[PDB]
Design an enzyme around this catalytic site. Sequence first.
Site, short mmCIF file in Angstrom:
data_model
loop_
_atom_site.label_atom_id
_atom_site.label_comp_id
_atom_site.label_asym_id
_atom_site.label_seq_id
_atom_site.Cartn_x
_atom_site.Cartn_y
_atom_site.Cartn_z
N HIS A 1 4.27 1.20 4.20
CA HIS A 1 3.03 0.72 3.72
C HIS A 1 2.07 1.16 4.76
CE1 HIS A 1 2.22 -3.43 5.58
NE2 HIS A 1 2.88 -2.70 6.28
N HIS B 1 -6.72 -0.47 8.37
CA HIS B 1 -5.74 0.55 8.87
C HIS B 1 -5.90 1.90 8.24
CE1 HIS B 1 -3.88 -3.67 9.10
NE2 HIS B 1 -3.64 -3.23 10.06
N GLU C 1 -2.26 -5.17 -1.37
CA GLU C 1 -1.88 -6.10 -0.48
C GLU C 1 -2.27 -7.29 -0.31
OE1 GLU C 1 0.27 -5.57 2.03
OE2 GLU C 1 0.49 -3.27 1.89
N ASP D 1 -7.15 -6.23 3.13
CA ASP D 1 -7.13 -6.51 4.60
C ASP D 1 -8.36 -5.63 5.09
OD1 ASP D 1 -6.23 -3.89 5.79
OD2 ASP D 1 -4.35 -4.59 5.79
N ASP E 1 -3.05 4.02 7.86
CA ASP E 1 -2.07 3.87 6.77
C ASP E 1 -1.67 5.54 6.93
OD1 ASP E 1 -2.65 1.69 4.56
OD2 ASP E 1 -2.31 1.30 6.44
N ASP F 1 -9.84 -0.20 4.33
CA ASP F 1 -8.53 -0.75 4.98
C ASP F 1 -8.98 -0.92 6.56
OD1 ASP F 1 -6.09 -1.08 5.52
OD2 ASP F 1 -5.36 0.16 4.19
N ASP G 1 -7.23 -1.80 0.24
CA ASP G 1 -6.38 -2.71 0.82
C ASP G 1 -7.37 -3.79 1.12
OD1 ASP G 1 -5.00 -4.30 2.62
OD2 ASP G 1 -3.90 -2.21 3.46
N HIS H 1 0.72 -1.24 0.00
CA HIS H 1 -0.02 -0.06 0.00
C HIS H 1 0.77 1.20 0.10
CE1 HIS H 1 -4.51 0.96 0.96
NE2 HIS H 1 -4.17 1.89 -0.10
#
Lengths: 314, 314, 314
Positions: A137, A122, A273, A230, A124, A120, A228, A97
Amino acid sequence: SRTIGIIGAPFSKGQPRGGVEEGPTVLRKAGLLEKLKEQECDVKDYGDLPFADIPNDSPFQIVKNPRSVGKASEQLAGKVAEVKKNGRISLVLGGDHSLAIGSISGHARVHPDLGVIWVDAHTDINTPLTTTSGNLHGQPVSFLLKELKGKIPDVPGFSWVTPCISAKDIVYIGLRDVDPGEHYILKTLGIKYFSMTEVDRLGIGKVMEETLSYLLGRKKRPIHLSFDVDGLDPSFTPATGTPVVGGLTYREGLYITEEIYKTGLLSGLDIMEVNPSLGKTPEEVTRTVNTAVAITLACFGLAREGNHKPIDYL
Amino acid sequence: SRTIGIIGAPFSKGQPRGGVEEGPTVLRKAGLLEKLKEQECDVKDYGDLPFADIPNDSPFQIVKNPRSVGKASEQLAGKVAEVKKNGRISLVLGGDHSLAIGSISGHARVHPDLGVIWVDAHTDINTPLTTTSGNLHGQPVSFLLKELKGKIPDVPGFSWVTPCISAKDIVYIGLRDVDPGEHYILKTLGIKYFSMTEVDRLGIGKVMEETLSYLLGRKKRPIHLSFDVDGLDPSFTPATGTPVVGGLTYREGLYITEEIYKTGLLSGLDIMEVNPSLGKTPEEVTRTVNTAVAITLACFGLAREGNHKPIDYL
Amino acid sequence: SRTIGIIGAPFSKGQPRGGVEEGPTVLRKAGLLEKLKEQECDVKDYGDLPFADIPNDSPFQIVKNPRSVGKASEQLAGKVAEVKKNGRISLVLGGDHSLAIGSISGHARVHPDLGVIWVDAHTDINTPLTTTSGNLHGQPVSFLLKELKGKIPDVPGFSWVTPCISAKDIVYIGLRDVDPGEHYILKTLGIKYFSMTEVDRLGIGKVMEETLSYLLGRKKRPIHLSFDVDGLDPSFTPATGTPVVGGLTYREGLYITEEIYKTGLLSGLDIMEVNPSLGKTPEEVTRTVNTAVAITLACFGLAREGNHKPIDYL
Ligand SMILES: N[C@](CCCC[B-](O)(O)O)(CCN1CCCCC1)C(=O)O
Ligand SMILES: N[C@](CCCC[B-](O)(O)O)(CCN1CCCCC1)C(=O)O
Ligand SMILES: N[C@](CCCC[B-](O)(O)O)(CCN1CCCCC1)C(=O)O
Ligand SMILES: [Mn+2]
Ligand SMILES: [Mn+2]
Ligand SMILES: [Mn+2]
Ligand SMILES: [Mn+2]
Ligand SMILES: [Mn+2]
Ligand SMILES: [Mn+2]
C-alpha cells in the site's frame, strides 16, 4: 447528472493490519448508498468483490503478499473498467491503498487521458526496491508511472500491470510523511505536489486552483481522485493504519472534494484505508466513517452552501 | 467610547430544547458584565425580560409555539428600541435565535439604515411555508426581509412585524447546513454569503474585508451582528441545540468580532443559542460559555494584540 | 552542514511552577539528540547547566527570585557564547523563558548583528516596574532592548546585562495575551509583531514572508529563534505554565520553523517552557514533548515534503 457505480473492495494484504477489509461494510452501514440517492444521484451497486485466498504467497524479497495484492488489483481493474464502460463514475470503497493499482489501471483502460489527484499523508511511490517496509500500500504509484518501468522488478502477481500515467498526470495533496527514496523520485520526476508545507503557505483555496489548472488547463479530461483517509488529520480520521499528525482539516477535505465535483470531470473515486478495528473507542470509528461519508457526498454534489432542486421553492 | 445596554432574553420556544433559557444566567455568572467594565466599557443592565406563559399556543400548520415566539420578539423589540434611544449598543443574551426578529426589528426602529452580519451554521431563512421542522429559530430572517412579504402567512403572534431589511442589507458568515428552500431563497434574492466553502477559499481575512466593504462601502451605517454560537465549530461551542461539524474556529470568531469592533459602527449585538443543559460534561458548558464571553468581549474592544489606556506606562 | 551545540537549562525560578526544570530531561529522553543525528546533523552535547542554589533571594520590590534568575542567565550566556565560538548553532532546552536574557546575550557577544524571532502567546516585555506578577519569565525582552535602558532598575543579579538588540531587531509571532504596559511599549517602540489577529488576517505564509523580509531584507544576518511552547495552542502543548487558547496550530509551528531553517541563517534556538508536571494526563505530557521535538527537528532540516541524501535512490 452524476451517476455512480459502487464497488466494494474488502482487501487488506497491502499492509499488516486486518480490519481495513471491513471498510466497505461500515461505510455502507453508515447509509452511504442511501445518502447518495438522497442527493442528485443515480447509484448502481456492483457489490463487494470476492478476493480468493492465495495461501501460498511468500515474500518477494521484502515485498509482502505480492500475489494476493496483485490479484486483488487485477480483479478490481476489471470491475472498474466495467463500470466505466457503463457510463458511471466508479466509487471504490477500500480496502488498503494498494488497490489503487487496480482502480487507476482499470479506469485508464477506458479513459487513457485521466489525471490523478492523490490526497494522502504519503506519496505511496516506493518501488519494490526502495521500500523498507515491504507493504504494498506504500508502493502503488510506482507501478502506475511510465517513467519508472525498468525500475520495477517482475513481482509475482503483477505481470498484468501496464503503467498508464506519466509524471505530469498526478498531483499530490497532503504530504507529510515521505520516505527518502520517495522524495528522491518526487524531485527527480518533477511530480507536482502540495505537501502540508504548501497548504500552509498558500491556503487550500490556491492549492485547488493550482491543482485543477495544472491538470485541466490544457485540455479537459477525466479526473481520478484517490483519497486516503489518512490525508486528513487523525483528529478527524483516527481509525486508519498509518495516521500522521498535522493533517488536512475536515474543512480542507470538503473544500478539495467540492471543488473537484464542480469541474464536472470526476470520473473515478477511491475512498481508502478506513480501518474500524483501529478505533480506540466506538466514537473514533464513528467519526472516521462519518468523515469518509461526508467526503464522498461532497464528491457527488453535496455543497456546504446548500443544494436545491430545479423548482420554485416559494 | 463604547457604551452598552444589556438585555437578558431567557426564551426557548423557537426550538424544542429547554435549556437555552439559561443562556443569560450562565453568561452573567461567567462574569460578563464585570469583564466588560474591566475594559473600556460603560455598561447598563436592563435586566432579564419577563416572558409571560402563553399556555394556549397550538401549532399554526406545522409552525410551533407561534404566539409565544411572536410575543417574546415583540417584547424584545420594545426593549432594544429603548436601549438604542438611550444611545447604547444593545447586547441581547439569548435565548434561541427566533429572538432575532425582535432584536433586529427594534434596532431598525431607531436606525432604519442598519446592515446585518449573521454568523451562523444556518441561514435561518425558512418561511412558515418552507420549514419542515416548524421551529421558529430557523425562520427569523424570512420575517425581516422586505422581498419576502406576501410569502409569509399571517402567523398568530406576528401581526406587529414589519419587515425592515432588504436582501442587500445582510451578509452571512459560516454557513454549512442550509435547507433546500433556504438555498433557493438565498440564490433567488442574491443575498451575500460566505459559507464555510468561501471561508476555506478566501481565508477569514478576505471574508471580513469583503463583508465590511460590501455593507459599508457606499455609506457608513450601524451594524447589527447576530451571532449564533453554532457558527463556531462544536469543538468550541458544544453546548448548543443544532451543532454542525466543520465550523469557524475560535480564532476566526475573534477575528470577525475584532474587525467589527474596529469599524466603530457596531450598534446591536445578539449572542444566541447557548444551551448549558446540552453540554455532555461540565467542561463542555464551561468551554461554550467561555467562548461566548470571549466573542462578546472582542465586540467591545478586547484585542489579541493587547490594549492599553491613554497614558505613559513607562 | 548544520551543526548544533546542545545546552540543557533546567531552571524554573523565573516563574512559580517547579516542573519546567525537567524540560531538558524529558526532551532528551524523547530521543531528541538521536533524532537530530538521524537527519543531517553534527550534534555536540554541552550537558545540563549546574545552577547553584541561591537560598537568599528576597524579592526586589515585586520582582521574584532576581538573583537566581540573573545568575542562571549569566551562566547561560557564557555557555551560549562558548558554543557559538565553536561554530555551532546553540540549542537551549529550557527551562523558563527568563533564560532568554542569557541565551540572546551570549549569542550576541559572538554575533552582535543577530535578529530575533520570538514565538509566543506573550510579549515577555514587562519591565521590573511594569510587571504586576513579578515573574521574570514575563520580562526578558525588556532587559535586552537598548531603547529601554534607564527604564530598567538595578535589579540584583543583573548588573552583568548589557542590552544587545534594538526595537527593529525583533519580530513577535503568536501574541494573544499582552499586558497593557507591554502593549504600550510595543506601540511606542514600533516593534514588528504578528499577533494571532495578523496570522488570522494574512495567513502564516505571508507572516513568514514578511517576517524574514523584515529581518533579512537589508542584509543577511544570524537568526535567533526563541520559541515558547505556549505560542502553540494548548491542544498541542498543554503541559506548560501559562497556556492561552486560540494559538498557532501544529502546522503553523512547523511552517514557521521550516521556513527559518531554509534561510540557512539559524544561529541560536531556545525551546522553552515545557513543564511535564503540568500535564493533566501522561498523554498530555507526551503530546507536548512530541510537539516540541517536532518543532526542533524542523529547525534543523526535517521537511514535511520529505528529505533525501545526495545519492541516486533508484
Ligand atoms: N512509507 C511507508 C508508509 C506507507 C503508507 C501507505 B498509505 O499512504 O496507503 O497509507 C512507511 C515507511 N516507513 C519507513 C521508516 C518508518 C516506518 C515505516 C511505507 O510502508 O512505505
Ligand atoms: N434548518 C433547520 C435548523 C435551524 C437552526 C436554527 B438556528 O441557526 O438558530 O440554530 C433544520 C431543518 N432540518 C430539515 C431536515 C434535517 C433536520 C432538520 C430548521 O429547523 O429549519
Ligand atoms: N504577562 C504575564 C505572563 C508572562 C508569561 C511568560 B512567558 O511567555 O515566558 O510564558 C501575565 C501577567 N498577568 C497580569 C494579569 C493577569 C494574570 C497575570 C506576566 O507574568 O507578566
Ligand atoms: Mn497514507
Ligand atoms: Mn495511501
Ligand atoms: Mn444555527
Ligand atoms: Mn441561528
Ligand atoms: Mn508565553
Ligand atoms: Mn515566553
